[PDB]
């Protein structure tokens, strides 16, 4: 196939100006969408704080308005999803991947509103869920919308604009441009066959998305963890030990979410009213735990700098890990709109910090700072649960800027992804697309 390739190499990277320009506008809208979605989620969380003050004396009434405020916002989000867009439940990264396989539709006229407003409800009530899901799905659909509006033709544009949407979408959720592009290249593209996704364009989308986010967010970083210490070579083996711990825990956590989806589906059977009533009990629990023990609730970005700084006791870190594993399953397996990405960072950070603490006390000749082990384990559940280790690495790299930790991060990740493979685990986003594509056939 020599002379074909001779002509193919010659015709390499010449993305049609039409697709390049359309990725430019797609990134800009996904930018504004994620910016607005972010300001929105914050505003309800603030109102919710100011309500607990108008009632800061009658401690039971305090616990009540904390429950009901999140119950109401939760239910609203469940309903908006069951009634008008069922595939905007849960994360939504499984659907955008399916859409790249051409096995699920991009129903943009329905999802943009359902996800955006549905998420504002579940995130804004302080449920343990991430902005990733919402912005990723929302962003891909925004790409289809401009595909349809401008009626561009071809697989290139349909797969590209669908991709450049979800990349710029994950970028704007973490001020994380490189992580976004890498998310498509390692995790979201069609995994078993070639694709025409023009990377130069996904790139133009991520730039514009990131510039919009910088216009509304500069001077404040999502995670400021300072510059930590370096890692001596004779310490690396301790990070691989950490990865092995994640590698067996990774799939163990994947199993629970699948079965917990089942155990919660038994709760409502499929009945839109039992379901929405359940999410008000979940959301109300979260807005309640968010008052009485905030570390067990919320997205989890807040407790990351605190855990890295060694500011928790070892007991507290154990408590938090259990509790946050509990409230993470309750929220994500219920199907409420919102990603799982962000809260898995916290579960990872918390675990590493606990590991770094024990590592500090066993090896004073090593001169450890528990903080480096948090930064390594932060992207670790991403590796052992969703099996996109290269994406978690550049993600944590972008958010904490401790590049001198590049080796223990890479090493703990490969450790988690290898032991997750060898203990019979599956990439979480791909094992969700399955049971979805399998029920979307088992009905026949």
């Amino acid at each position, epitope marked *: 196939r020599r002379r074909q390739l001779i002509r193919q190499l010659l015709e390499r990277d010449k993305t049609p100006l039409a697709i390049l320009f359309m990725a430019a506008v797609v990134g800009t809208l996904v930018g504004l969408a994620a910016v607005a979605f972010d300001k929105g989620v914050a505003w309800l969380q603030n109102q919710r704080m100011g309500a607990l003050v108008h009632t800061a004396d009658n401690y039971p009434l305090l616990l009540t308005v904390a429950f009901l405020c999140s119950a109401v916002l939760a239910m609203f989000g469940y309903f908006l999803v069951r009634k008008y867009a069922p595939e905007a439940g849960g994360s939504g990264i499984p659907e955008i991947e399916g859409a790249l396989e051409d096995q699920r539709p991009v129903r943009w006229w329905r999802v943009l509103p359902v996800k955006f407003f549905g998420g504002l409800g579940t995130l804004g009530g302080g449920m343990v869920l991430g902005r990733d899901g919402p912005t990723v799905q929302i962003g891909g659909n925004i790409g289809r919308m401009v595909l349809d509006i401008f009626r561009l033709k071809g697989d290139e544009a349909r797969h590209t604009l669908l991709a450049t949407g979800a990349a710029a979408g994950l970028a704007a959720a973490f001020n994380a441009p490189l992580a976004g592009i890498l998310f498509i290249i390692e995790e979201m593209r069609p995994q078993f066959r070639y694709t025409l996704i023009s990377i130069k364009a996904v790139f133009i989308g991520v730039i514009m998305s990131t510039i919009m986010y910088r216009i509304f967010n500069h001077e404040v970083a999502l995670i400021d963890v300072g510059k930590l*210490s370096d890692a*001596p*070579l*004779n*310490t690396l083996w301790l990070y691989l030990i950490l990865g092995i711990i994640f590698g067996i825990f990774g799939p163990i956590f994947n199993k629970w979410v699948l079965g917990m989806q089942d155990l919660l589906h038994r709760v409502h059977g499929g009945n839109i009213t039992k379901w929405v009533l359940m999410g008000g009990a979940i959301g109300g629990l979260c807005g309640l735990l968010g008052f009485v023990a905030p570390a067990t609730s919320g997205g989890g970005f807040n407790l990351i700098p605190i855990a890295t700084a*060694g500011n928790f006791s070892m007991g507290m870190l154990v408590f938090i890990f259990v509790a946050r594993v509990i409230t993470t399953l309750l929220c994500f397996s219920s199907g409420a709109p919102g990603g799982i990405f962000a809260p898995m960072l916290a579960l990872g950070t918390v675990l590493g910090t606990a590991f770094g603490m024990v590592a*500090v006390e066993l*090896f*004073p*000749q*090593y*001169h450890l*700072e528990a903080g480096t082990f948090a930064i390594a384990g932060m992207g670790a559940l991403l590796a052992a649960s969703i099996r996109a280790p290269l994406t978690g690495i550049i993600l944590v790299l972008e958010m904490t800027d401790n590049y001198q930790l590049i080796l223990p991060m890479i090493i703990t990740g490969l450790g988690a992804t290898l032991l997750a493979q060898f203990t019979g685990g599956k990439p979480l986003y791909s094992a969700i697309l399955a049971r979805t594509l399998a029920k979307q056939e088992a009905e026949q």
Partner: antibody
Framework: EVRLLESGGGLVQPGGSLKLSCAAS????????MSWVRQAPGKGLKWIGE????????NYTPSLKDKFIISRDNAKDTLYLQISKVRSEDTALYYCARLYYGYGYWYFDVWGAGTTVTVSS | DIVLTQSPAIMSAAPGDKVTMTCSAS?????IHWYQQKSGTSPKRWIY???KLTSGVPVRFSGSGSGTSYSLTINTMEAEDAATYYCQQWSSHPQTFGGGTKLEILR
């Protein structure tokens, strides 16, 4: 240059107390651990303790409770050692030192001139 | 903790000449460090990680060994090489120095 200059050493009565000071000049005094090592007259080098830049973990040799108090002032670029209940065993030349590493087995990177603590009545 | 006992407690040797001292440890030790103290001056870090020179240290110096026995050596000695050579470990905690080995010119 990189200079470690320590003062505070003198004559002290037994059971009294002294606070040696180590003054840093030529490098970022944070990001470095510091350490005190004393050398009894005509004897070997002895390790007192060490202290990490954030003052968050201080280690001392197997020696008593409040005997030694290592502390540091990153604003002032200065390292402190307080010896309490001074015996004649504490008569020695006290060295201030900055720590580093290579393969991760740590060493005593750059030392200072020293100060002398005499304990007699 | 880990006792280090340097061997030729005092010793002399003529200039341009091979010298060899020894560090010797009760338990096992990895990568030892060697400092040179001259009468009246701060100790100097001379050799680290079993084998590694420092900037300025002349290449007549060398370290070697393993486990529970290391050593410093001068292929051709000089005059400025007269000092005390202290070995020290941190493979284990807490770290420990040896007794010293005084190197004096022979004449």
């Amino acid at each position: 240059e990189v200079r470690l200059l320590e003062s505070g050493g003198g004559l002290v009565q037994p059971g009294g107390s002294l606070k040696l000071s180590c003054a840093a000049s030529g490098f970022d005094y944070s990001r470095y651990w510091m350490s005190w090592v004393r050398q009894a007259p005509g004897k070997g080098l002895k390790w007192i303790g060490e202290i990490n830049p954030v003052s968050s973990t201080i280690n001392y040799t197997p020696s008593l409770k409040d005997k030694f108090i290592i502390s540091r002032d990153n604003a002032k670029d200065t390292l402190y050692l307080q010896i309490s209940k001074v015996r004649s065993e504490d008569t020695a030349l006290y060295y201030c030192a900055r720590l580093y590493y290579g393969y991760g087995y740590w060493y005593f990177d750059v030392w200072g001139a020293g100060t002398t603590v005499t304990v007699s009545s | 903790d880990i006792v280090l006992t340097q061997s030729p407690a005092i010793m002399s040797a003529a200039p341009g000449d091979k010298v060899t001292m020894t560090c010797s440890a009760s338990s096992s030790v990895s990568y030892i460090h060697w400092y040179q103290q001259k009468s009246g001056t701060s100790p100097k870090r001379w050799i680290y990680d079993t084998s590694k020179l420092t900037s300025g240290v002349p290449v007549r110096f060398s370290g070697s060994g393993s486990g529970t026995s290391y050593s410093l050596t001068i292929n051709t000695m000089e005059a400025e090489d007269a000092a005390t050579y202290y070995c020290q470990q941190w493979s284990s905690h807490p770290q420990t120095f040896g007794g010293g080995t005084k190197l004096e010119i022979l004449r």
